[PDB]
């Protein structure tokens, strides 16, 4: 009474083949579940991580390849551009032809790159300002440096867009690096070595003279600059409550409270806000409201920027644009950048060009690429089994608050309010098959010249930024998606109160109409509750049914949340990670995603038990002496099989907001009664510790 279905027979052979028979589930369930995935496999030289999740992404790229690279005489204008785009992106001979010339075409737009100019001060430095310089970067090229000023959905009013000012992202992976010793020594050496390599070609190309000692010199100053800017930046720990973060202001007080003297100006926020947004000649006066995320970062910069030349700063800011552009040029430039990605990512090669390239248009043209993937790739009724599945997991989420003892029932009950108010997204806008015009229409400012990859790169940039600036005074498009379809993840938004499940996940092992439902709830199921639960993690707990940051928690129900979730803080926090040299995870930077793992799994078990009840138990699959109940957990586990190169683990541990997969599993399993019951685990089995963290 085993099913012998091919689509049964198929799953069996995937499961056993990843599992190692010969470990105790209750001693290390990762090895249980993943032990023979590990044995057989080795990280590829272009990976920093590898594993099932990744291999799914790798298989998205083939299909994108199957579906970008062959002209179709009936393609509509919108398809035709991506493909142009794509074809343009894979023509190396052409990109090499052109050596460096394409930024040289640029430098002068961005007031140049001092360390590769003759007599900089006199070519640009008369003119240079802060506001335009920084503002040009932002506005054309939407690289944000020194002072990050953007437009986003407003956290108090989520029909409404507004302008934010924040600290800058940085050259290295996180502020920790700029310590620049021990396990960041290399990366640091390689980052300025890179500034160097690149400043050097640039000049070569200029037929200028190389003073390697003065390069060593300029480029190391630049480093000292970002170091100081790094130290001024706020930790992720203190950014992680959106009530302390959200401080709303007019350029007015802003101009008053956070003044800045750059070059000896001093700095004019109304200048530089206008010298950006008048890139759709939108109009900005000293009573503009403005959300400031990094009050202190700007308190802190005056003292810094005080001591730097106009030239000091543009070498940094210009070298932070030029960084990224570099892989859009000839081998000789790309080369520049080996040691710096081995130092960061551990890889000894780049990934296949068709790959990087598929991914670029997918990212730049998501809707249009969206379309092609679904036609190739994704089955469509799908959309309908999911929704119900989602139904299911919704209720169970409703089910459960009654049963949670740490809340009071005013709060229990609003929570309900977000509940049914969650809007779901599955697969893709029917839009994007249905409606050629809109499609052609959203790309219509686009035109791509197949011998012009840079030029398109550069278009596409100026696109999206102006696409973004466009937005100050418009209402949030209710209709818009946060994922391309094209993608193997799923999401939750606060603005939107929305859960998103791209066709890209809508596929094995998380879901097929056809495998057993055990693995469906094990899989997409736990994923649906992952997103919903983000609902209420330490971030989205502060957001109401409409996107809006407004406090709907009983005083004491708050203190209780913290009280419960503090437990996870401490659990995952004492996880130490060999691949990262034994370093401890960061249990705060991970609370959200840990919290929502644990919610979602249980959420989903319950959904599956219920399926028990009303549908009755289902035929077993060959090969495996386990029951469905455990298979549930099996699939959950196997989602996250794989491993990590050392360099990127260091990096991950400071820059990811997930836990690594092996602890997404053990932390969460360590916390699952349904678990250690399934697998009949002695008390204080390592997978079965008495203390068990719970919140949702
Ligand atoms: C910042 C990028 C990630 C955004 C989505 C967050 S809520 C998340 O946790 N997504 C889940 C999706 C998921 C859930 C359960 C199981 C598998 C996948 C996630 O873990 N994404 C991983 C793959 C990631 O984005 O790094
Ligand atoms: C690459 O571009 C070059 C030079 O512009 C051109 O000769 C060639 O046809 C292109 N290759 C392909 C197949 O796109
Ligand atoms: C901003 O002011 C600068 C000098 O502060 C000036 O040169 C520039 O044109 C101004 N731009 C706008 C839009 O006010
Ligand atoms: C380790 O977890 C324990 C359990 O309480 C906690 O007390 C301690 O703070 C944790 N250590 C770390 C690194 O936070
Ligand atoms: Zn998540």
XYZ file of C-alpha atoms and ligand atoms in Angstrom:
765
model
C 0.000 0.000 0.000
C 3.050 1.925 -0.825
C 2.409 4.075 -3.902
C 4.517 3.044 -6.885
C 3.967 6.252 -8.857
C 6.805 7.512 -11.021
C 6.265 10.874 -9.393
C 6.254 8.812 -6.212
C 9.190 6.684 -7.297
C 10.993 9.913 -8.158
C 10.767 11.509 -4.757
C 11.864 8.449 -2.846
C 15.087 8.354 -4.761
C 15.802 12.023 -4.104
C 15.147 11.635 -0.388
C 17.222 8.549 0.439
C 19.975 9.743 -1.770
C 20.446 12.911 0.258
C 19.960 11.185 3.604
C 22.586 9.045 5.225
C 20.936 5.990 6.716
C 23.422 5.597 9.508
C 23.036 8.615 11.745
C 20.670 9.163 14.662
C 18.018 11.649 13.716
C 17.987 12.740 17.369
C 21.720 13.413 17.570
C 22.273 15.605 14.407
C 19.324 15.886 12.027
C 21.265 17.869 9.464
C 23.676 14.913 8.985
C 20.743 12.542 9.216
C 18.983 14.350 6.465
C 21.883 15.679 4.394
C 24.811 13.436 5.173
C 25.111 11.891 1.734
C 24.435 15.108 -0.078
C 27.557 16.345 1.659
C 29.661 13.265 0.835
C 29.171 13.253 -2.938
C 29.229 16.932 -3.618
C 31.861 19.601 -3.707
C 31.503 23.333 -3.966
C 32.155 24.436 -7.460
C 34.852 26.925 -8.024
C 32.322 29.664 -8.905
C 30.250 29.050 -5.782
C 30.695 30.539 -2.373
C 27.740 28.429 -1.384
C 26.281 25.277 -2.903
C 23.443 23.067 -1.935
C 19.904 22.267 -3.003
C 18.518 25.694 -2.704
C 21.367 26.930 -4.947
C 21.149 24.053 -7.346
C 17.471 25.075 -7.910
C 18.637 28.552 -8.828
C 21.270 27.015 -11.123
C 18.451 25.216 -12.907
C 16.431 28.397 -13.250
C 19.285 29.798 -15.300
C 19.235 27.008 -17.945
C 15.568 27.614 -18.553
C 16.219 31.318 -18.842
C 18.908 30.322 -21.248
C 16.490 28.034 -23.175
C 14.141 30.980 -23.395
C 16.231 34.078 -23.880
C 18.684 33.039 -26.581
C 16.481 32.016 -29.541
C 14.765 34.784 -31.530
C 11.054 34.284 -32.132
C 9.599 36.024 -35.135
C 6.335 36.619 -33.316
C 7.975 37.950 -30.108
C 6.356 41.262 -29.004
C 8.490 44.313 -28.731
C 8.984 43.670 -25.060
C 10.521 40.229 -25.378
C 12.638 41.551 -28.205
C 14.471 44.009 -26.025
C 15.327 41.574 -23.296
C 16.815 39.219 -25.858
C 18.643 42.036 -27.538
C 19.755 42.823 -23.996
C 20.796 39.292 -23.386
C 22.586 38.826 -26.708
C 24.272 42.118 -26.083
C 25.474 40.904 -22.717
C 27.084 37.684 -23.954
C 29.183 39.268 -26.794
C 32.673 39.367 -25.128
C 34.638 40.119 -28.290
C 32.596 43.220 -28.548
C 32.896 44.086 -24.871
C 36.638 43.514 -25.097
C 36.989 45.508 -28.377
C 36.108 48.465 -26.310
C 38.651 48.112 -23.551
C 37.979 50.808 -20.983
C 36.537 53.571 -23.095
C 32.987 53.478 -21.576
C 33.768 54.999 -18.089
C 36.230 57.482 -19.538
C 33.053 58.438 -21.279
C 31.725 58.698 -17.716
C 34.370 59.935 -15.332
C 33.728 63.483 -16.408
C 30.011 63.181 -15.723
C 30.817 62.346 -12.105
C 33.448 65.097 -11.811
C 36.126 62.539 -12.499
C 38.342 60.092 -10.598
C 41.115 62.096 -9.044
C 43.787 59.393 -8.751
C 43.571 59.010 -12.530
C 43.555 62.638 -13.487
C 46.150 65.160 -14.503
C 45.673 68.221 -12.276
C 42.318 67.224 -10.798
C 41.690 70.249 -8.648
C 41.741 72.481 -11.753
C 39.563 70.362 -14.067
C 36.602 69.792 -11.683
C 37.398 71.106 -8.190
C 36.406 74.676 -8.929
C 32.993 73.305 -9.652
C 32.711 70.181 -7.505
C 30.116 70.149 -4.819
C 28.946 67.718 -2.288
C 25.452 68.177 -3.402
C 25.858 67.791 -7.150
C 28.708 65.347 -6.989
C 26.989 63.077 -4.503
C 23.756 64.107 -6.165
C 24.892 63.100 -9.716
C 25.887 59.643 -8.552
C 22.517 59.297 -6.883
C 20.455 60.721 -9.739
C 21.798 59.320 -12.996
C 23.463 56.213 -11.675
C 21.647 55.818 -8.446
C 24.754 54.829 -6.702
C 24.464 56.337 -3.285
C 27.603 57.389 -1.483
C 28.401 59.417 1.652
C 24.790 60.376 2.299
C 22.204 57.884 1.126
C 19.008 59.672 0.166
C 16.243 57.647 -1.441
C 12.503 57.389 -2.014
C 10.427 54.601 -0.442
C 6.950 53.760 0.752
C 6.418 55.803 3.957
C 6.171 53.713 7.128
C 3.445 55.872 8.692
C 1.334 56.116 5.532
C 1.582 53.263 3.111
C -0.183 54.745 0.189
C 2.375 57.436 0.386
C 5.942 57.677 -0.769
C 8.545 59.818 0.870
C 12.156 60.671 0.925
C 14.576 59.005 3.358
C 18.121 59.927 4.334
C 20.296 57.054 5.626
C 23.958 56.064 6.032
C 25.792 54.678 2.990
C 26.323 51.034 2.172
C 30.054 50.341 2.061
C 32.761 48.938 -0.157
C 33.366 45.857 1.937
C 30.658 43.438 3.017
C 30.058 44.937 6.441
C 31.472 47.498 8.876
C 33.213 44.684 10.741
C 35.668 44.293 7.853
C 37.157 47.726 8.277
C 38.715 46.413 11.439
C 41.012 45.017 8.807
C 42.747 42.424 10.880
C 42.658 38.705 11.483
C 40.014 37.071 9.341
C 39.519 40.350 7.504
C 43.201 41.039 6.872
C 43.209 39.714 3.310
C 39.943 41.214 2.252
C 41.228 44.543 3.383
C 44.559 44.206 1.642
C 42.798 43.097 -1.528
C 40.251 45.939 -1.515
C 42.821 48.708 -1.779
C 45.024 46.559 -3.977
C 41.985 46.508 -6.191
C 41.415 50.257 -5.992
C 44.969 50.200 -7.176
C 44.938 47.720 -10.008
C 41.999 49.647 -11.370
C 43.409 53.156 -11.007
C 46.402 51.769 -12.851
C 44.775 50.462 -15.997
C 42.704 53.579 -16.157
C 45.863 55.636 -16.496
C 47.743 53.212 -18.748
C 44.793 53.680 -20.975
C 45.210 57.417 -20.619
C 48.840 57.073 -21.502
C 49.729 58.692 -18.268
C 52.696 58.017 -16.015
C 52.483 55.542 -13.157
C 53.638 56.552 -9.708
C 52.888 53.364 -7.840
C 53.979 54.945 -4.534
C 51.484 57.810 -4.936
C 48.816 55.283 -5.812
C 49.640 53.174 -2.775
C 49.075 56.599 -1.343
C 45.883 57.977 -2.727
C 44.114 54.644 -2.490
C 45.045 54.073 1.145
C 43.762 57.463 2.152
C 40.464 56.495 0.542
C 40.439 53.436 2.806
C 41.052 55.583 5.897
C 38.066 57.641 4.728
C 35.698 54.650 4.558
C 37.115 53.265 7.762
C 35.973 56.462 9.539
C 32.663 56.370 7.673
C 32.345 52.717 8.600
C 32.883 53.378 12.338
C 30.298 56.144 12.193
C 27.688 53.761 10.827
C 25.132 52.218 13.145
C 25.261 48.498 13.872
C 22.510 46.294 12.510
C 21.590 45.592 16.125
C 20.480 49.171 16.702
C 18.675 49.516 13.345
C 16.305 46.724 13.935
C 13.366 48.389 15.586
C 11.479 50.569 13.165
C 10.187 52.854 15.920
C 13.622 54.088 16.949
C 14.606 54.176 13.354
C 11.742 56.335 12.057
C 12.408 59.977 12.851
C 10.452 62.317 10.500
C 11.689 65.844 9.670
C 11.608 68.816 7.286
C 14.780 69.538 5.413
C 14.105 72.329 7.871
C 15.176 70.937 11.252
C 17.370 68.731 9.202
C 19.277 71.708 7.945
C 19.312 72.866 11.546
C 20.244 69.809 13.522
C 22.516 67.935 11.174
C 24.584 70.526 9.365
C 27.698 69.514 7.438
C 30.710 71.525 6.318
C 32.092 69.841 3.202
C 35.075 71.347 1.397
C 34.188 74.226 3.572
C 30.773 74.835 2.262
C 28.819 74.201 4.435
C 26.259 71.757 3.100
C 22.751 72.634 1.922
C 20.195 69.892 2.176
C 17.734 71.882 0.040
C 20.328 72.267 -2.663
C 21.179 68.620 -2.816
C 17.634 67.329 -2.394
C 16.598 69.620 -5.248
C 19.764 68.924 -7.284
C 18.536 65.345 -7.260
C 14.769 65.400 -7.583
C 14.823 67.990 -10.421
C 15.764 64.958 -12.420
C 12.124 64.885 -12.953
C 11.900 68.650 -12.213
C 9.968 67.955 -9.099
C 10.091 70.748 -6.658
C 11.403 70.707 -3.103
C 11.202 73.383 -0.431
C 12.515 73.671 3.133
C 9.302 72.200 4.602
C 9.576 68.901 2.827
C 8.907 66.149 5.336
C 11.741 63.646 5.543
C 12.293 60.366 7.351
C 15.824 60.164 8.755
C 17.193 56.697 9.521
C 20.698 57.724 10.627
C 20.478 60.814 12.790
C 23.661 59.885 14.566
C 25.485 58.842 11.400
C 25.238 62.489 10.353
C 25.968 63.876 13.736
C 29.045 61.815 13.399
C 30.210 62.681 9.876
C 30.625 66.454 10.324
C 33.684 65.697 12.448
C 34.861 63.379 9.654
C 34.062 65.272 6.480
C 35.458 68.296 8.270
C 38.976 67.024 7.693
C 38.821 65.878 4.060
C 39.596 67.614 0.771
C 37.174 67.891 -2.082
C 39.627 65.423 -3.712
C 39.856 63.160 -0.696
C 36.159 62.369 -1.053
C 35.612 62.009 -4.813
C 38.322 59.358 -4.945
C 36.179 57.299 -2.583
C 32.834 58.156 -4.127
C 33.977 57.788 -7.693
C 35.811 54.555 -6.827
C 32.611 53.190 -5.344
C 30.768 53.641 -8.630
C 33.678 52.349 -10.610
C 33.905 49.223 -8.523
C 30.656 47.873 -9.866
C 31.058 49.061 -13.450
C 34.298 47.187 -13.775
C 32.779 43.791 -14.625
C 30.956 45.453 -17.472
C 34.210 45.978 -19.425
C 37.065 43.995 -20.901
C 38.657 40.934 -19.424
C 41.539 43.130 -18.503
C 39.348 45.135 -16.167
C 37.427 42.120 -14.876
C 40.704 40.432 -14.049
C 41.366 43.356 -11.703
C 38.954 41.918 -9.289
C 39.925 38.329 -8.750
C 41.718 38.525 -5.486
C 38.990 40.715 -4.013
C 36.217 38.194 -4.702
C 38.311 35.234 -3.534
C 38.933 37.193 -0.366
C 35.181 37.823 -0.026
C 33.527 34.810 -1.606
C 36.270 32.203 -1.796
C 35.774 31.609 -5.498
C 38.645 31.116 -7.907
C 36.610 31.847 -11.028
C 33.539 33.690 -12.191
C 30.348 31.997 -13.142
C 29.429 31.371 -16.749
C 28.793 34.520 -18.768
C 25.407 33.328 -20.032
C 24.606 32.887 -16.410
C 25.613 36.283 -15.059
C 23.807 37.510 -18.087
C 20.502 35.752 -17.911
C 20.436 37.015 -14.392
C 21.029 40.612 -15.328
C 18.053 40.931 -17.673
C 15.877 38.843 -15.392
C 16.653 41.464 -12.790
C 16.263 44.467 -15.054
C 13.339 43.286 -17.018
C 11.627 40.974 -14.516
C 8.153 41.143 -15.948
C 9.236 40.491 -19.480
C 11.488 37.688 -18.359
C 8.779 36.724 -15.956
C 6.538 35.971 -18.921
C 8.882 33.571 -20.706
C 9.687 31.476 -17.654
C 6.054 30.644 -16.956
C 5.382 29.598 -20.544
C 8.502 27.405 -20.539
C 8.252 26.286 -17.111
C 5.251 26.610 -14.818
C 2.053 24.790 -14.939
C -0.665 27.184 -13.887
C -3.264 25.198 -11.927
C -0.520 25.212 -9.571
C -1.644 28.760 -8.813
C -4.860 27.276 -7.487
C -3.629 24.472 -5.261
C -1.285 26.948 -3.653
C -3.949 29.489 -2.815
C -5.921 26.895 -0.885
C -2.785 25.599 0.787
C -2.396 29.227 1.776
C -5.947 29.311 2.899
C -5.177 26.344 5.029
C -2.118 27.893 6.635
C -3.907 31.187 7.246
C -6.607 29.564 9.374
C -4.141 27.476 11.275
C -2.378 30.701 12.042
C -5.715 31.969 13.247
C -6.341 28.673 15.017
C -3.407 29.139 17.142
C -3.296 32.491 18.880
C -6.162 31.237 21.050
C -3.713 28.597 22.127
C -0.855 31.032 22.744
C -0.684 32.002 26.366
C 1.743 34.880 26.263
C -0.758 37.365 24.839
C -3.751 39.199 26.172
C -6.880 39.038 24.106
C -7.207 42.596 22.907
C -3.894 41.815 21.259
C -4.760 38.249 20.369
C -7.648 39.709 18.452
C -6.170 42.531 16.443
C -3.417 40.156 15.385
C -6.300 38.242 13.972
C -6.873 41.553 12.247
C -3.641 41.217 10.165
C -4.552 37.595 9.679
C -7.247 37.637 7.086
C -5.931 40.957 5.901
C -2.838 39.298 4.500
C -3.009 39.434 0.722
C -1.319 36.672 -1.159
C 0.505 36.561 -4.517
C 1.053 33.346 -6.453
C 3.036 32.653 -9.619
C 2.860 35.798 -11.696
C 0.613 38.654 -12.734
C -1.732 37.192 -15.271
C -0.933 40.683 -16.383
C 2.169 39.575 -18.008
C 0.773 36.944 -20.345
C -2.402 38.832 -21.022
C -1.530 42.362 -21.769
C 1.092 43.144 -24.343
C 0.719 46.974 -24.209
C 1.406 47.422 -20.514
C 4.349 45.117 -21.038
C 5.772 46.907 -24.070
C 4.761 49.994 -22.233
C 6.894 49.617 -19.111
C 9.965 49.035 -21.261
C 9.160 51.628 -23.938
C 11.685 54.174 -22.780
C 14.108 51.341 -23.374
C 16.253 50.913 -26.407
C 19.235 48.615 -26.573
C 22.094 48.525 -29.057
C 23.598 45.027 -29.256
C 27.185 46.341 -29.564
C 26.605 48.521 -26.544
C 26.494 46.455 -23.357
C 27.942 49.199 -21.184
C 25.637 51.741 -22.700
C 22.675 49.564 -21.830
C 24.069 48.846 -18.425
C 24.133 52.579 -18.039
C 20.708 53.203 -19.443
C 19.253 50.490 -17.279
C 20.771 52.190 -14.264
C 19.406 55.678 -15.122
C 16.170 53.951 -15.869
C 15.464 52.506 -12.560
C 16.574 55.498 -10.490
C 14.368 57.929 -12.386
C 11.792 55.179 -12.285
C 12.293 55.445 -8.516
C 12.526 59.184 -8.113
C 9.349 59.384 -10.194
C 7.494 58.371 -7.160
C 7.620 60.949 -4.381
C 4.154 62.266 -5.010
C 2.417 59.205 -6.406
C 0.322 56.692 -4.558
C 1.826 53.278 -4.056
C 0.634 51.191 -6.954
C -1.632 48.631 -5.311
C -1.058 46.430 -8.326
C 2.706 46.050 -8.240
C 4.689 42.884 -7.312
C 7.885 42.683 -5.230
C 9.245 39.652 -7.028
C 9.709 38.897 -10.623
C 8.074 35.547 -11.149
C 11.419 34.528 -12.218
C 12.747 33.724 -8.849
C 13.284 31.005 -6.317
C 12.412 32.655 -3.050
C 9.319 33.908 -1.365
C 8.680 37.110 0.490
C 6.688 39.173 2.964
C 6.185 42.949 2.964
C 5.255 45.342 5.768
C 3.934 48.171 3.532
C 1.769 45.779 1.698
C 0.830 43.194 4.268
C 1.609 40.805 1.445
C 2.929 37.313 1.038
C 4.558 36.527 -2.347
C 5.320 33.142 -3.819
C 7.035 33.396 -7.186
C 6.580 30.550 -9.617
C 10.312 30.007 -8.983
C 9.639 28.362 -5.658
C 6.368 26.901 -6.879
C 8.219 23.721 -7.716
C 9.929 20.701 -6.212
C 10.930 20.030 -3.611
C 8.592 22.554 -1.960
C 5.517 21.642 -4.091
C 4.191 19.562 -6.929
C 0.581 18.682 -7.526
C 1.967 15.232 -7.658
C 4.292 14.329 -4.808
C 2.871 13.403 -1.433
C 1.365 16.176 0.591
C 3.567 15.403 3.557
C 6.388 17.013 1.566
C 4.178 19.799 0.305
C 3.417 20.914 3.829
C 6.991 20.013 4.675
C 8.037 22.311 1.857
C 6.120 25.248 0.361
C 3.843 24.828 3.333
C 6.491 25.740 5.888
C 7.485 28.462 3.451
C 4.005 29.975 3.426
C 4.044 30.225 7.134
C 7.542 31.576 6.979
C 6.289 34.584 5.145
C 2.992 35.001 7.006
C 4.767 34.749 10.311
C 6.992 37.658 9.219
C 3.678 39.125 9.896
C 4.659 39.334 13.477
C 8.397 38.850 13.934
C 10.208 41.614 15.724
C 9.878 43.808 12.604
C 6.442 43.205 11.204
C 4.868 42.895 14.673
C 4.962 46.685 14.642
C 2.946 46.971 11.438
C -0.781 47.132 11.196
C -3.227 45.733 8.762
C -2.449 48.387 6.083
C 1.335 48.714 6.017
C 1.347 51.404 8.672
C 3.680 51.584 11.597
C 1.211 51.803 14.399
C 1.348 50.208 17.747
C -1.366 47.646 18.327
C 0.219 45.715 21.126
C -0.860 45.756 24.751
C 2.027 47.147 26.801
C 2.463 43.806 28.529
C 2.005 41.767 25.398
C 5.001 43.614 24.014
C 7.199 42.865 26.970
C 6.180 39.301 26.639
C 7.079 39.056 22.965
C 10.538 40.328 23.746
C 10.434 38.029 26.671
C 9.739 34.995 24.469
C 11.832 35.966 21.459
C 14.736 36.778 23.649
C 14.900 33.018 24.046
C 15.740 32.468 20.344
C 18.211 35.294 20.656
C 20.131 33.181 23.107
C 19.702 29.786 21.425
C 21.049 30.506 17.961
C 23.520 32.841 19.607
C 25.424 30.000 21.196
C 25.550 28.176 17.960
C 29.147 28.332 16.798
C 30.030 27.770 13.191
C 33.100 25.767 12.243
C 33.138 26.976 8.729
C 33.373 30.472 10.144
C 36.248 29.548 12.494
C 33.952 28.722 15.388
C 32.559 32.254 15.497
C 29.092 32.560 17.003
C 26.142 33.465 14.886
C 24.552 36.796 15.658
C 21.257 35.951 17.298
C 19.811 39.417 17.020
C 20.692 40.096 13.446
C 18.904 36.737 12.917
C 15.894 36.997 15.239
C 13.353 37.800 12.554
C 14.134 34.927 10.221
C 14.738 32.393 13.016
C 11.446 33.398 14.642
C 9.610 32.850 11.412
C 11.189 29.495 10.684
C 9.807 28.109 13.965
C 6.382 29.654 13.448
C 6.095 28.502 9.923
C 7.111 24.882 10.425
C 4.614 24.337 13.230
C 2.081 26.432 11.468
C 2.485 23.911 8.687
C 2.584 20.653 10.584
C -0.762 21.698 12.023
C -2.017 22.368 8.532
C -0.884 18.868 7.674
C -2.371 17.131 10.696
C -5.671 18.748 9.839
C -5.121 16.983 6.521
C -4.791 13.825 8.455
C -8.102 14.440 10.066
C -10.258 15.242 7.088
C -8.551 13.307 4.299
C -6.913 10.335 6.038
C -3.394 8.917 5.855
C -1.688 8.462 2.489
C 0.122 5.663 0.700
C 3.794 5.311 1.620
C 6.631 5.552 -0.972
C 9.177 2.814 -1.634
C 12.690 2.719 -0.322
C 12.311 4.493 2.994
C 11.449 2.959 6.360
C 9.805 6.165 7.574
C 6.287 7.415 7.997
C 4.821 10.501 6.342
C 4.906 12.360 9.591
C 8.700 12.162 9.492
C 8.911 12.669 5.729
C 7.223 15.977 6.510
C 10.328 16.867 8.481
C 12.538 15.145 5.990
C 11.646 17.496 3.179
C 11.805 20.480 5.454
C 15.328 19.398 6.378
C 16.479 18.616 2.884
C 15.584 22.079 1.575
C 18.669 23.311 3.310
C 21.286 20.629 2.528
C 24.649 22.064 1.604
C 27.682 23.975 2.720
C 29.759 27.070 2.579
C 33.274 28.210 1.772
C 35.119 29.695 4.751
C 35.486 33.121 3.332
C 31.805 33.523 2.673
C 30.791 32.101 6.030
C 32.704 34.891 7.696
C 30.872 37.105 5.315
C 27.442 35.410 5.747
C 27.630 35.447 9.505
C 27.818 39.249 9.387
C 25.682 40.000 6.371
C 22.913 37.430 6.127
C 19.693 37.791 8.039
C 19.052 34.137 7.810
C 20.825 31.645 9.915
C 22.763 29.175 7.873
C 20.655 26.232 6.768
C 22.135 23.649 9.051
C 21.029 25.705 12.079
C 17.806 26.782 10.504
C 17.187 23.088 10.908
C 18.637 22.250 14.318
C 17.508 25.411 16.061
C 14.036 24.875 14.712
C 13.961 21.142 15.260
C 15.451 21.605 18.744
C 12.248 23.592 19.342
C 9.731 21.197 17.858
C 7.724 18.844 19.991
C 6.041 17.534 16.841
C 9.607 16.776 15.946
C 11.245 14.752 18.675
C 7.958 12.900 18.938
C 8.069 11.948 15.245
C 11.538 10.520 15.725
C 11.056 9.252 19.234
C 13.918 11.128 20.829
C 15.272 10.603 24.362
C 14.826 13.699 26.465
C 17.939 15.944 26.278
C 18.879 14.380 23.069
C 20.824 17.152 21.422
C 17.927 17.554 19.095
C 15.651 17.411 22.108
C 16.637 19.817 24.866
C 14.191 20.476 27.720
C 14.306 24.223 27.331
C 12.392 25.098 24.175
C 11.999 28.552 22.689
C 8.593 29.431 21.398
C 6.657 32.468 20.231
C 4.302 31.731 17.339
C 16.335 39.344 2.062
C 16.106 38.163 1.111
C 15.067 37.189 1.678
C 13.683 37.841 1.758
C 12.632 36.844 2.255
C 12.886 36.431 3.711
S 11.426 36.822 4.695
C 13.078 34.954 3.806
O 13.363 34.395 4.852
N 12.847 34.268 2.708
C 13.013 32.841 2.850
C 12.175 32.130 1.807
C 12.191 30.683 2.220
C 11.507 30.293 3.346
C 11.532 28.979 3.756
C 12.236 28.038 3.041
C 12.948 28.427 1.909
C 12.930 29.755 1.509
C 14.454 32.469 2.738
O 14.922 31.763 3.580
N 15.185 32.955 1.740
C 16.581 32.588 1.667
C 16.776 31.490 0.628
C 17.372 33.758 1.275
O 16.785 34.621 0.693
O 18.669 33.874 1.531
C 29.368 40.369 -31.499
O 29.493 41.721 -31.864
C 30.440 41.719 -32.908
C 31.123 43.082 -33.087
O 30.228 44.158 -32.946
C 29.782 41.165 -34.177
O 30.736 41.074 -35.219
C 29.136 39.793 -33.915
O 28.163 39.475 -34.910
C 28.478 39.726 -32.535
N 28.259 38.354 -32.149
C 27.053 37.834 -32.005
C 26.840 36.421 -32.460
O 26.138 38.461 -31.509
C 22.358 74.019 -5.728
O 23.185 75.018 -5.195
C 24.421 74.973 -5.861
C 25.399 75.678 -4.931
O 24.973 75.423 -3.604
C 24.199 75.540 -7.272
O 25.396 75.675 -8.014
C 23.220 74.592 -7.971
O 22.860 75.019 -9.266
C 21.970 74.487 -7.112
N 20.988 73.582 -7.656
C 19.706 73.754 -7.352
C 18.732 72.893 -8.102
O 19.312 74.569 -6.513
C 24.165 31.134 25.370
O 22.827 30.738 25.561
C 22.590 30.933 26.947
C 21.272 30.343 27.453
O 20.705 31.230 28.407
C 22.613 32.419 27.279
O 22.426 32.513 28.658
C 23.912 33.078 26.869
O 23.753 34.474 26.879
C 24.215 32.650 25.455
N 25.501 33.146 25.030
C 25.534 34.050 24.066
C 26.678 34.023 23.098
O 24.651 34.885 23.948
Zn 12.103 35.238 5.892
